[PDB]
Amino acid sequence: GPDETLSLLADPYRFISRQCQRLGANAFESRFLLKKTNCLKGAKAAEIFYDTTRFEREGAMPVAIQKTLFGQGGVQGLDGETHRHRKQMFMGLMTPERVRALAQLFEAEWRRAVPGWTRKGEIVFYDELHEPLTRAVCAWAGVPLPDDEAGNRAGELRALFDAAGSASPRHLWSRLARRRVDAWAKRIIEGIRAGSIGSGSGTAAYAIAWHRDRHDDLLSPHVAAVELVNVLRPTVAIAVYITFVAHALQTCSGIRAALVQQPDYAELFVQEVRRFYPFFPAVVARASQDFEWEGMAFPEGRQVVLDLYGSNHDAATWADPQEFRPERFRAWDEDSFNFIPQGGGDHYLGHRCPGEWIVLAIMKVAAHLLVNAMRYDVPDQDLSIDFARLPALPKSGFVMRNVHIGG
Numbered sequence: 001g002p003d004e005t006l007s008l009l010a011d012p013y014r015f016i017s018r019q020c021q022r023l024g025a026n027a028f029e030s031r032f033l034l035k036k037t038n039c040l041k042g043a044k045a046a047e048i049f050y051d052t053t054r055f056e057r058e059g060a061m062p063v064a065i066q067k068t069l070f071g072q073g074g075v076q077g078l079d080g081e082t083h084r085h086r087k088q089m090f091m092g093l094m095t096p097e098r099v100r101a102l103a104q105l106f107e108a109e110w111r112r113a114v115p116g117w118t119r120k121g122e123i124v125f126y127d128e129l130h131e132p133l134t135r136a137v138c139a140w141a142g143v144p145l146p147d148d149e150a151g152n153r154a155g156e157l158r159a160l161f162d163a164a165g166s167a168s169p170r171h172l173w174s175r176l177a178r179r180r181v182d183a184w185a186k187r188i189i190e191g192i193r194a195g196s197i198g199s200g201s202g203t204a205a206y207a208i209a210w211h212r213d214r215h216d217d218l219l220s221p222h223v224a225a226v227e228l229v230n231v232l233r234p235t236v237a238i239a240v241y242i243t244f245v246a247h248a249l250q251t252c253s254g255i256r257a258a259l260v261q262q263p264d265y266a267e268l269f270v271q272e273v274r275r276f277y278p279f280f281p282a283v284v285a286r287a288s289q290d291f292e293w294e295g296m297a298f299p300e301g302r303q304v305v306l307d308l309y310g311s312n313h314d315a316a317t318w319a320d321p322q323e324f325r326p327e328r329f330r331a332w333d334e335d336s337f338n339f340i341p342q343g344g345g346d347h348y349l350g351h352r353c354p355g356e357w358i359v360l361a362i363m364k365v366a367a368h369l370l371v372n373a374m375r376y377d378v379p380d381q382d383l384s385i386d387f388a389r390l391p392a393l394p395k396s397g398f399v400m401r402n403v404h405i406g407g
């Protein structure tokens with residue numbers, strides 16, 4: 001068949017589900033970067049995608065993603081016992097107490113940043129979030145971050161995910177940002193190992209610097225650096241979800257009141273923001289052995305893409321996925337495959353995002369602050385979601401005026 005890379009790139013979140021709807025199927029064979037690719041969508045497809053006896057990640061992600069989004073040698077590219085041993089290192093960071101600590105640091109940094117926002121008179125909300133998140137996560141992770149460098153590090157971390165999927169010179173900036181952030185994280189790992197940096201025993205940078213692999217060897221410093229950036233970078237990417245929290249509050253009538261007046265509502269609300277809004281489009285794996293599934297061939301070595309956005313909008317699962325309705329989560333049975341904005345399956349046994357607890361905790365802080373503490377005006381602007389952008393955002397970035405926290 002024809003190469004459809006251009007069609008995918010023009011509609012990265014919806015290309016797969018639009019083609020599925022046309023064909024009346026949850027899977028179809030296509031071709032990207034000249035490679036035959038099976039595209040999958042929905043709960044049943046997610047369950048097979050997460051079967052590690054049939055799928056592997058090693059070598060699956062296009063190498064332009066190593067130079068930017070993920071780095072080289074990190075957990076995303078591992079399989080089998082090597083993967084599970086590395087994954088445990090990340091999971092150990094995520095205790096309720098440690099997640100709460102990061103949420104508290106983020107609230108503090110948000111409150112610290114407000115006076116600057118008031119003084120500007122008008123802000124692009126998305127643009128203002130990267131730095132407080134950077135400051136909170138570095139402190140949490142045991143990464144020293146001088147006051148006068150926080151801004152620059154926040155821009156570099158942002159560039160890894162926000163400029164990575166840009167078909168322009170912004171991609172070149174993402175590559176330089178990656179080189180810089182790796183070198184910085186590497187100096188941090190080296191200083192922890194030499195004892196010149198006193199990160200605490202509970203902190204991410206300590207855990208990663210002192211992690212021993214399956215042969216009782218420390219991670220090479222570059223790999224430790226990449227894994228540390230695998231904590232810092234996606235925490236800063238929560239800026240996207242926080243912007244969507246603001247977008248939902250602005251565009252969906254009744255949400256603000258319910259959040260104000262119903263205490264259990266915030267949990268439902270942040271889950272629905274993750275279900276509803278596009279963010280991580282799709283994940284890629286390679287078939288590890290010959291099999292067939294639902295009348296489709298999966299020859300060993302076949303590239304396979306699992307459409308996360310389409311799965312989160314699958315009508316069989318949700319009935320009315322096109323609506324923004326937090327109360328739908330009252331009927332959710334916590335299935336590991338039917339709701340997958342940060343991946344599916346098991347956190348320890350597969351590649352599912354270990355950052356979900358942090359994301360939920362921080363999105364709740366954001367919701368709380370935006371309804372209970374912050375006052376702001378929202379001028380006329382284009383709030384529509386840019387489905388052509390990676391990551392997707394409201395076209396305006398969400399512009400606020402007259403921000404303050406007397407509220």
Ligand code: HEM
Pocket residue numbers: 075076077087090230231232234235236237238239241279280283308341342343344350351352353354355356358359
């Ligand atoms: C900002 C919102 C986030 C989104 C949309 C997101 C989404 C995802 C997705 C889709 C995956 C891949 C699942 C797969 O390969 O099957 C993933 C993996 C990962 N996430 Fe996140 N994530 C976010 C935040 C975070 C945070 C805060 C952390 C901090 C620890 C984090 C750390 C990771 C790591 C280390 C992996 C690789 C895990 C593995 O391969 O086993 N993420 N994430």
Ligand SMILES: CCCCCCCCCCCCCCCC(=O)O
Pocket residue numbers: 062064069161162164165166233234235237279280281390391
């Ligand atoms: C060859 C073109 C590749 C296009 C690159 C696509 C990048 C995906 C963008 C999704 C939003 C980024 C989410 C942050 C993820 C993370 O921090 O790990």
